[PDB]
Symmetry: C4
């Protein structure tokens, strides 16, 4: 096996097609399905799998009570076959913790899990299913990472971490790993003012991460990483098509180098594909809550502070709950370009549906097509009343 190199550009995105969906909450009403949240998708050279943070209980289990909570000793990064649900019997534990990322470099997979109390957390870096390196908290305030896949080039896999306040300036670092070992780390540079939960993808131009500004911004910060030089820059998506949640209404001028104001101390993990005229942004339909999901084609969104949509696709109706979203691609697929893909977490239960005492989710995932395909909408599909 050889390390994968990012030698291709993105395929032209003319629409999005259904890729995967697990219907986990529907099935978990009467099966041993683990409670999860913060899901993602990641490919190996021979298989693509669903990933998420388990809560160490099934949905119908009495221990599902209280699973709105983010950080417990009972969480772990698990993976399971594409579009199956995460069950007790089919889920493979990658590592133990409550914040994660994972990626295959072409030879083996690196997985990183952070665990610990708020003031004493630590990351453990696994490579080829063995622990290899560890990183202690540097700011003693909830060391945390991407919650979606990382990306590798010639064995080098950059990962974005943040330690510090969620409501003020924090200490963000970009780490560069190879075979699980730390080659280098850097402090965040550039004009992004707060960074959390980066969603990344790679192509010949380098690695592009679309993150969340939890502090002041409703536009999304972007980190652009050169995995060869092991350097990065940062800014915001310039476009006035704002993609955090909650968020203000779309203005006609966005902000390239500072947070667009209106909403403080909140946000949701999201993603974009920034590729000139082939640029597509994901966002919740609602400006107020994590409901609905749509893709918008916004030419030069990264660099054009006046850019508006010229095409779109609804993924989840506003009437249906969404949640986190992130990027991944099958870097080992045949062809001359990388096909952009994404997932949307469909959160069920608390806080929005409080007649149940649990919080979980299911997954829907799409990839791009060069055709202009008809659109459907893709709800979680579970009836909450059944769980009462």
């Amino acid at each position: 096996r050889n390390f994968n190199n990012l030698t291709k550009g993105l395929c032209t995105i003319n629409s999005w097609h259904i890729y995967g969906k697990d219907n986990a909450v529907r099935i978990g009403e009467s099966s041993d399905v683990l409670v999860t949240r913060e899901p993602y998708v990641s490919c190996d050279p021979d298989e693509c799998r669903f990933y998420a943070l388990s809560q160490g209980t099934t949905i119908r289990g009495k221990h599902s009570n209280g699973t709105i909570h983010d950080r417990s000793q009972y969480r772990a990064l698990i993976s399971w076959p594409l579009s199956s649900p995460p069950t007790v019997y089919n889920s493979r534990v990658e590592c133990i913790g409550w914040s994660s990322t994972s990626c295959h470099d072409g030879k083996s997979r690196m997985s990183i899990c952070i665990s610990g109390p708020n003031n004493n957390a630590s990351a453990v870096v696994w490579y080829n299913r063995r622990p290899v390196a560890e990183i202690n908290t540097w700011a003693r305030n909830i060391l945390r990472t991407q919650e979606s896949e990382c990306v590798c080039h010639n064995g080098v896999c950059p990962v974005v971490f943040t330690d510090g306040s969620a409501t003020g300036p924090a200490d963000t670092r970009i780490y560069y790993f190879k075979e699980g070992k730390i080659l280098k780390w850097e402090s965040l540079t550039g004009t992004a003012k707060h960074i959390e939960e980066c969603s990344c993808y790679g192509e010949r131009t380098g690695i592009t991460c679309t993150c969340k500004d939890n502090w002041q911004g409703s536009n999304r910060p972007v980190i652009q990483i050169d995995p060869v030089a092991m350097t990065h820059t940062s800014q915001y998506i310039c476009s006035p098509v704002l993609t955090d949640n909650p968020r203000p209404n779309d203005p006609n001028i966005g902000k390239c180098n500072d947070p667009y104001p209106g909403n403080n101390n909140n946000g949701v993990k999201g993603f974009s594909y920034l590729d000139g005229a082939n640029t597509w942004l994901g966002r919740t339909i609602s400006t107020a809550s994590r409901s609905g999901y749509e893709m918008l084609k916004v030419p030069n969104a990264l660099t054009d502070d006046r850019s508006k949509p010229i095409q779109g696709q609804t993924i989840v109706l506003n009437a249906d709950w969404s949640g986190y979203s992130g990027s991944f691609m099958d870097y080992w697929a045949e062809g001359d370009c990388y096909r952009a893909c994404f997932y949307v977490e469909l959160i069920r239960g608390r806080p929005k549906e409080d007649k149940v005492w649990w919080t979980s989710n299911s997954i829907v995932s799409m990839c791009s097509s060069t055709e202009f395909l008809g659109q459907w909408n893709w709800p979680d599909g579970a009836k909450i009343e059944y769980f009462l």
Copy 2:
């Protein structure tokens, strides 16, 4: 690995032997068995598997309520080990959608799933477990396909699609795929007047598909495909032994080039093996409903409008519910001929058994023997009262 070529003729069919049976509804009374419908069987070079469209819920699950419905966002093509039932924990998702086909070309498997609303559906073509090509609806009226396996020759895998009315003229296309890519498509030609749900098999003479005329016909249309020239012809089975359901009683003269009349706007997926004196037709025993199943040896049924049975075998008693049926063969078996096989879907629940709120099925499957074997009958075997 090499692409499989269709170099053999059919084995002589003197009777049918039991091949597989999953007892899914019996077992699902007290296990995590997925609700399915539209099952089939398909072989890889090293394994044969059961396939079906899941409904994204188990039978005992409360979400089984309403599963008579054909098209939802919660359906997917799944496969699972031969004669096991389709469980949450053993089922592998091939793709997402509510109409499907799948076949192995000798190197890798192609699977096709259609999803979407009635007026905006699309097919996604997967090859070696990755999405490769997509096809948008061309008539904006429930794009739909075989619901049983396709067949390949030297890498070329033809598939029959229909888009348009189920109760009038529609737009049927034959697509020719290789490694998931579209080589060519054609509009339906010949004398078949309506085409749905083709059941296909291959042998040295080419690929033969027995389909359903939903509009006016109770004889079955046939499409004969040359996978090298990538051309086809169509007509009906000439025989007065009528094999759709519901259907009129058998006359003494059938129809080769037009629907045999009496029943409109209905039908069931079915199959036949058309091989001169070695010809066998499958049909429900009842002329009114999807109950019973029998095989009849009808020499030259394809071309002889007077042909009658000279031998038969009961598969399912008229007292027991049947459903869809279709063809498959193990193209990678040893020997000098291809052994004809088929499955029968045994539908339980709605609409015929409405004391439960679900619709599902189990599977029975047979292959041919050159012996003249004794016959049994093969019911689903579940007691509906247990589910109340």
Copy 3:
């Protein structure tokens, strides 16, 4: 891979050690464990597995009601990992039917299942997981076979079948298969007067089968098969240590060439290892019912009509239910001799425990040791009251 040859003799048997036990009924009280009966064990070159006839329902499932019945359309030969229980999710279906045998020849496995009504049954012979040959009933009265593993030598795998009365003379045939194909069959010859449910093992001397005389005998008939010449002889175990069940008390003179009288129209599947001074016989402890199990060292039991035990080992206490027992060996183990092994079916439920409506079993299995090991006893271990 090469065909296995029977080149070794039996290891010296000085005691028996625990090999496997699945505790299926205990576990099935609260898990999705299939109802079974007629279990056995059989090895591949790289794995040994448990086998049995499923009843197509779990124990806790409502369809467990009525499973005392031997022959239904819902039965199948399944296999599952050594000492695991037969669950819905881990059981692999080998073929469909209600009487079976199975064996590996060193290259691939042959499995045979018989299905059908009493007067029209048929055997289907599978090889390398594909159907290869079929055999129709020859006496139209419950065609039936070993219910434990067959044995192979240089690709030739003999199997004993019986068709006809269980309470009078029947038509027994020995079939010789290679790669699933019929090389030859013979009618039973020799002095055995009735043959059912042969338990076989192989060693340099040939293949030895210990069977059951259901008609008149309480001594066990023996068939000795030369798999090279494809010929056989038959007689009874000469020893007055009688090993059928039910049975008369042990006399001081046994019978070599005729059934020992006292009990008609009954019996149980059993086994022995016949190896001169290294001879051990298995039997139920009770003379009246299928309870208890013991091994007795009876020198030259096959040929000495005065032979008595000189050593023994209790396997199951008389207070605990037993059932069928049979032989198998790991022909692919290291060393200079074949280690004799056996299983005992531990039947729970009907007819002996009729407060439940089901019949199932668990498995215990032992292999020989050259040490003189201490003995334990090995009950099924389930409490019937828990199922009420």
Copy 4:
């Protein structure tokens, strides 16, 4: 494949990081999780797995009643994927019995299980999943072994056994196996006065086992084994940091060659890493019961009868139940040193929590880091009230 040689020293231990945790009791509240106890962890060259003695029932199963009992015919050594729980459907049975050890030699795995009544127990030694050798009881009083992994060097795998009193002098033997065969055994020599449940690890210096003195000692006996010469020595950990449970308070002078007195006829399985200045000891926090767990860095604990801690890490709070603990390492990991690892059994149910009728456990496991990582605490996490 080659036999593994112990060519590396221990990595420098500066803290401990989370390695695995299965949350078995939480999950088993509503899943088919087997009741276990006496767990451990052991690596193959390509995978690390959890191990334990099943009780042959699930937790929610009615047969969980009475599982405080140590020795029944329904127990078996099972293994299952790292950090998954031990379920009916994912657990692989290694052998049958109520006391065990297991280790991989680089080519294949040896597993040993002891079964039988108290006065007639026997060990069966399995290698490459086949029974190879058997050992009868030599003192007729509960033949018993490590309950955690053994260690191998160049194919030789030493194992410590004890047969005889738990409350007085007993007969301890060290056996040396290769490919499952007995090369040699020795009677215990040295100054250890009672030996049970040894926890072992290997490094260039040889194999080191930290055991339990059940009779008189609250310091731990140590056996040091040379796997090449196949010889051993024994003594106690000299340190006054006492590590059995229950135990007296820590004095200022320990005992090197005799049991430290205060507590008789009790103890718990435990472990240590004895490596000069890199020495770390594990112990329960409580001196009275199996609650809490901590690691203490105690330089030269093995040889210095005045040695005290200079660093520590809490693993489980005193408020939470612990249990057995033992050592293992991934001998096939990359790098220049072996990373010390351990597990802690977290016992739930009887005798400490008697509102339920069962006894089971979950597992937490840690490995060493060269970083000084922040510490968390790792409870079982189940709420007993949910099981009522």
